[PDB]
Amino acid sequence: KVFGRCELAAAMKRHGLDNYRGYSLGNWVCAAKFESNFNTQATNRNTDGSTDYGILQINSRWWCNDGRTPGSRNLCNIPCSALLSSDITASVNCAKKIVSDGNGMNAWVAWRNRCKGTDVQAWIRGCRL
Numbered sequence: 227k228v229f230g231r232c233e234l235a236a237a238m239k240r241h242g243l244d245n246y247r248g249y250s251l252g253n254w255v256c257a258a259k260f261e262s263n264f265n266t267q268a269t270n271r272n273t274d275g276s277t278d279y280g281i282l283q284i285n286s287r288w289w290c291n292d293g294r295t296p297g298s299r300n301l302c303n304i305p306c307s308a309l310l311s312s313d314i315t316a317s318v319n320c321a322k323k324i325v326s327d328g329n330g331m332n333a334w335v336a337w338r339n340r341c342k343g344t345d346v347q348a349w350i351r352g353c354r355l
């Protein structure tokens with residue numbers, strides 16, 4: 227599923243991401259834009275042989291199982307395929323664990339490089355929330 231910007235903002239807010247570990251909703255929408263372009267089916271191979279899955283490009287190295295990432299963990303206890311669903315519940319539940327891991331949203335290199343310190347509120351502009 228390719229979410230609308232405001233459509234994704236609403237779904238993330240409903241699932242409790244607005245101000246989760248102090249990160250305003252615009253941060254999460256900005257991260258999703260640059261990670262996936264809001265496409266739940268987005269997959270991208272990393273140089274380390276791990277793969278990133280879904281709207282928030284969650285890594286098979288630590289967070290989900292894809293069965294082809296040697297020496298990897300599955301800390302979200304999910305098949306990586308479950309992070310591609312049109313329902314973002316598994317991605318959001320897993321993102322809450324990632325962002326709580328110690329480095330906050332710096333875990334998303336695209337957030338650090340493209341969203342951090344910017345006017346992230348612009349990403350929820352004109353949305354009925």
Ligand code: NA
Pocket residue numbers: 286287288289290291292293295298299300
């Ligand atoms: Na894994």
